[PDB]
Ligand binder design. Structure first.
Ligand SMILES: CC1(C)CN2C(CS/C(=N\C3CCCCC3)NC3CCCCC3)=CSC2=N1
Ligand SMILES: CC1(C)CN2C(CS/C(=N\C3CCCCC3)NC3CCCCC3)=CSC2=N1
Lengths: 420, 415
């Protein structure tokens, strides 16, 4: 086979990203870099991400000049462009891994374990993400050179065997996607598990945990209504029907968690069906979502849906207005302290009655979305390389790899785009 | 040629030691400590591999006689064993981290991890990684002998799998093991801070008799604050002005503990006692050195005897008879309880885990040196020619079989 339809259209893509990326990241480093005021730890990591992108976007006119006609830059700049691309390739994804780590420490070890969150943001990021990637750039400092093949000069990495190619193109999948990707997905699974337990701890304080059958109808665990029927043996049959064994009126703390988690999912599925509740729950955050779930566990789907003004105020982020409006209700004088805690939870968004993770989820997912078509492409090239699929299809796939790598560069002008 | 005599030698020993060894381990807990239950998973993994070792010997001595199907089966059993063994040890490290660092926070997810996660994470992904070996291993009908091994389409397929092997087999499990150990070593070294914090007290200002900072750290014996600040400024390098941070106090405490351990390990009476003691009981001995000092603690000749003899109830009652106990009861009562129980109750086994993991990696270490050199020549960095190239290939052959002893170090671990 042999190695240009998208080569005068492709340089416009580097230019769009250079113009958006330089202006975008430039004003972020202008705002963040010289400011002292409102700094959640993720903003410090975002500055590291913005500086990494800014350094790399400066390299884009070179990519565009190389794509249009030639490489007039020389030996040193061929190495520099290649080293700046590698540092931005590894640091970016690893900054998101350190951002995901920060979230794990913020949700799981909030008070349980003092911050190492300060150390990762102030010092570790330099020698744990910056320096390794700055040293991983060494094979590109010498193997990347200027070729004077035809009157047209080609600047790229010239290794010696191919067996040197796959060992580095595996190092790229490992350090670039496998190692940081695991960290991010681990945090995203540990959090949602130990965050849907805070709902247990919130409702244990409010509804109460009873391991034996109590009443005013027959009840078990975190307020699980078994039957309205005036018969204890009928309550046993309803208990054994949805738990497994013939328990006989007594359950345990660990197995009580499961029963409650089933009622949480049933209420969540119900909220996602209610015309009034569905948009509000989708608008709210984890803690404020749990405060609304708490209300469904007490009033019910219809009971919550009734609070027209407050639900609209919760949907529109008007916290103090929603809390004041909710205080002027039937519920606030029915259960003064349970409503006091829930209202103040809706007011602040914290567990202070006993930290936003949502923009982080968007940032990582958008980065994953940017690089996804390139990963879809690169795999097919590796599939044809191993002789799994079969020359016209080979060079046409290479074409999409060129455009997807350039469309993936949009990840640079996104961290600044996130501030909407 | 010598490998026709030396490989069956290494196979025979490892077969007998491995079959009699792992066999016992299975039948013991075939009908409960969670660090053992994984050790049972290892015996099922290792015994299956030892069961295939006569095939290795027959095919090293003479011919492959066992057909195409059994060629694939030996390749799969080897692959399963390669990935399960190392990943069980990762889960062993993971369990200890949850047992030491999250002793209460994450109480029993270990009960699930050892019952459920082990099959979805160690067994299933290893048995699904057995697929390339199931396809590519076949019997080559060669001229004078039949050869059993994997034959891939191109040299690229070789690289893809022979590097995948280093990730899910060495980099990924090793990265888990090392990080777990790094956090355990940090939590138990933290834990001693909390002990002395309850006993010698923590503060960021000074006191006198004797100017002191942090957790009973004597700045100067001289009655001059200028010298107390001068000692403090130089203790943590940076300018202090007489004040330090809680996190900064740990740095001074670790310096005080490590220097005390450097004292104990350079003392003939205390070194055999400290080496024999566990993490919790080691901290209790250190606590005593912070109160009495080397010479003072080394004086309890009768007490130090039972501490290194695993007779706790005998040592505790003997120590309550000393001058030290009645003169200072509260602290001494709490330290005696530490030796007696091995728990932090006054304020989980770790050594077999560490030995098992170090012994496993030591077993595999020479093979990794040999496989490292072979990859250096294949990639063209080293150059002596083909003479040392076969010497390296002779090394890999011997070191790979010599690294099967890993199957043996689980039942042998009961010593
Ligand atoms: C991975 C990589 C850095 C490698 N590469 C490549 C191959 S090198 C290269 N130019 C540049 C890539 C990035 C650094 C500067 C040279 N080739 C040609 C040169 C003539 C015009 C078309 C592209 C294209 S896009 C890309 N990205
Ligand atoms: C990684 C691997 C399984 C690959 N391999 C090999 C190559 S296959 C093989 N026999 C067996 C190894 C493992 C499965 C059964 C075939 N070769 C020869 C046949 C001629 C005499 C020496 C051994 C030897 S030891 C080893 N280790």
């Amino acid at each position: 086979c042999f190695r240009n339809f998208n080569k005068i259209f492709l340089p416009t893509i580097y230019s769009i990203i250079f113009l958006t990326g330089i202006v975008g990241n430039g004003l972020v480093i202008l705002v963040m870099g010289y400011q002292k005021k409102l700094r959640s730890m993720t903003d410090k990591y975002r500055l590291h991400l913005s500086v990494a992108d800014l350094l790399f976007v400066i390299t884009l006119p070179f990519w565009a000049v190389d794509a249009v006609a030639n490489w007039y830059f020389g030996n040193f700049l061929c190495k520099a462009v290649h080293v700046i691309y590698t540092v931005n390739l590894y640091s970016s994804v690893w900054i998101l891994a350190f951002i995901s780590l920060d979230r794990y420490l913020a949700i799981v070890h909030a008070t349980n374990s003092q911050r190492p969150r300060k150390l990762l943001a102030e010092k570790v990021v330099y020698v744990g993400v910056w320096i390794p990637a700055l040293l991983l750039t060494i094979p590109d400092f010498i193997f990347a050179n200027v070729s004077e093949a035809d009157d047209r000069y080609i600047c790229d990495r010239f290794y010696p065997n191919d067996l040197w190619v796959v060992v580095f193109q595996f190092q790229h999948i490992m350090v670039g996607l496998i190692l940081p990707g695991i960290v991010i997905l681990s945090c995203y699974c540990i959090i949602i598990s130990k965050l849907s337990h805070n709902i247990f701890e919130m409702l244990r304080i409010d509804e109460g945990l009873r391991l034996k059958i109590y009443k005013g109808y027959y009840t078990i665990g975190i307020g699980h209504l078994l039957t309205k029927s005036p018969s204890l043996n009928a309550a046993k049959s309803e208990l054994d029907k949805a738990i497994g064994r013939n328990t006989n009126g007594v359950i345990t703390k660990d197995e009580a968690e499961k029963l409650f988690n089933q009622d949480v999912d049933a209420a969540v599925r119900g909220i996602l069906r209610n015309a009034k509740l569905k948009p509000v729950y989708d608008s709210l955050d984890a803690v404020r979502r749990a405060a609304l779930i708490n209300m469904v566990f007490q009033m019910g789907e219809t009971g919550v849906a009734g609070f027209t003004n407050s639900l609209r105020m919760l949907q529109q982020k008007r916290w103090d207005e929603a809390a004041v409006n909710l205080a002027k209700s039937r519920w606030y004088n029915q259960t003064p302290n349970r409503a006091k805690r829930v209202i103040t939870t809706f007011r602040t968004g914290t567990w202070d009655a006993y930290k936003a993770l949502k923009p982080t989820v968007i940032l990582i997912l958008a980065f994953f979305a940017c690089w996804l078509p390139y990963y879809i492409g690169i795999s097919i090239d590796s599939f044809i390389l191993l002789e799994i699929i079969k020359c016209e299809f080979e060079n046409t796939v290479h074409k999409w790899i060129s455009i997807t790598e350039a469309l993936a560069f949009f990840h640079c002008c996104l961290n600044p785009i996130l501030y909407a």
